[PDB]
Design a protein around this ligand. Structure first.
Ligand SMILES: NC(=O)c1ccccc1N
Ligand SMILES: NC(=O)c1ccccc1N
Lengths: 208, 208
C-alpha cells in the first residue's frame, strides 16, 4: 500500500530548477541536510525540557553520516523530532510553497542556489546530488513512514515496516552516477569541517 | 502582579559575556532579531496550512522596525506565532541552556559573538545594544504577556493589559546611552540591506 501525491506546482518547479540549472557548488546539499537534522534535534530537546518522557524513545541526540559504496547511498540519520504522516505530505514540515516564491524572487535579485536554506526549502538541495531521495521518519505521535521521490512531479508515502528506528529521521540519498565523491571519507570530512563545524550535536562519520 | 524569576546559571553567564566582552560589531543584534521574527512567521504560516483559523487573529504576516528617539527605543514587531507564558519562562522558546554550552565551546574554537544565532540564542544579542529589553507577546492558545529584564540575573513576567496586539511578538529594545545610532533611518537601512535583504517577509521601517 503505497500512496502517490503530486508535488504542488511551485515545488515541482523548484526541483527542476535545482536539477537543471548549471551550478558547480553542489557540496552545500550536506550543510542544508545537517541543518535540518540540527533543527529537528532542537525541537525535541525543547519539547522534553517540559516533558522528559518524549525522550523515552531515545535519550541520545546526534547526527550520523553513513556512506555506502555498494548501493551508491549516503544516509544522514538523526534522533530528532521526526515527522508525522501529515507532516511528510505537507512538504516534509517545511513551508515550501511560499518559501519557493521567496527563493525564486531572491534569484531575481542576485542570490545563488546556496541560499536555499534561508527560505526554508534547503531539503530540496539533496537533488543537487541525488537522483532519488528516501526519507524514513518516526515521530512520537504516529508510526514509522517512508517518503520517496525521484522528482518527476510526484512523491510516494508508505508505512515503513522495516527497521523500527525509535525516533528521528533518515534521509537516504541515492546519489547520481557522477556524484560518488560524496561517498569519500576524505571528502565528507572536508565538507563537514568547512560548512558545519559549529553544529551543536555530535556528528559521526561511519566507515566502510 | 509581576513575578520574578532567576535566569538559569548558563544564561546569566551568556548575558554578562555579551555585556562585558569587547566586541565592536554590535550591529548583528538586528539580524538575530529579524531571524527570530522570520522563524515565528514560518511557524504560524505552517500551522495555518492545515487550519486557516489560526489566522483569525491577523491574516497579514510582516516585520516592522519602529525607532523612537524620544524614549530611546527601537521595537521589532512581528505578527508571527508569539509565545505562551510557559514559553516566555522557558528562555523565550529557545533551548538556551544547551545552546549556551555549544556557544561557549565554539568560542573555545575560534567563533566570534556573531555566530550566536547558529546555537539558537541569538535573542540575547539584543544586550549588545540594549540596557533593558521588554518582550510583549501574544499567542493564540494564551493571553498577552510582557517579559522583561535588564540582566542582573533575573527576569519578570506580567500579564500585559495594554494595547491588545492580536497575535505576534514585540521586542522593545531600550537602547544604551551610546548606541543611539540604531535609531537612525539611514543606519537601519544600511544594516537591513547588508544583513537580511533576502528575508521572506516584508519589513517596514517606520519614520518619526
Ligand atoms: N532531518 C529532518 O527531520 C528533516 C529532513 C528533511 C526535511 C525536513 C526535516 N525536518
Ligand atoms: N520574534 C519572536 O517571536 C521571538 C523574540 C525573542 C525570542 C524568541 C522569539 N521567538
Amino acid at each position: 500500500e503505497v500512496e502517490t501525491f503530486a508535488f504542488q506546482a511551485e515545488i515541482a518547479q523548484l526541483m527542476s530548477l535545482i536539477i537543471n540549472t548549471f551550478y558547480s557548488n553542489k557540496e552545500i546539499f550536506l550543510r542544508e541536510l545537517i541543518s535540518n537534522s540540527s533543527d529537528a534535534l532542537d525541537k525535541i530537546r525543547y519539547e522534553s525540557l517540559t516533558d522528559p518522557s518524549k525522550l523515552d524513545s531515545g535519550k541520545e541526540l546526534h547526527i550520523n553520516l553513513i556512506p555506502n559504496k555498494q548501493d551508491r547511498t549516503l544516509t544522514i540519520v538523526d534522533t530528532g523530532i521526526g515527522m508525522t504522516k501529515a507532516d511528510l505530505i505537507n512538504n516534509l514540515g517545511t513551508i515550501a510553497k511560499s518559501g519557493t516564491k521567496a527563493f525564486m524572487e531572491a534569484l531575481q535579485a542576485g542570490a545563488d542556489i546556496s541560499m536555499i536554506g534561508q527560505f526554508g526549502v534547503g531539503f530540496y538541495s539533496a537533488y543537487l546530488v541525488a537522483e532519488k531521495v528516501t526519507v524514513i521518519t518516526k515521530h512520537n505521535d504516529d508510526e514509522q513512514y517512508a517518503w520517496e521521490s525521484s522528482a518527476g512531479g510526484s512523491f510516494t508515502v508508505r508505512t515503513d515496516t522495516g527497521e523500527p528506528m525509535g525516533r528521528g529521521t533518515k534521509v537516504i540519498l541515492h546519489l547520481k552516477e557522477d556524484q560518488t565523491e560524496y561517498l569519500e571519507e576524505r571528502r565528507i570530512k572536508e565538507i563537514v569541517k568547512k560548512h558545519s563545524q559549529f553544529i551543536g550535536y555530535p556528528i559521526t562519520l561511519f566507515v566502510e
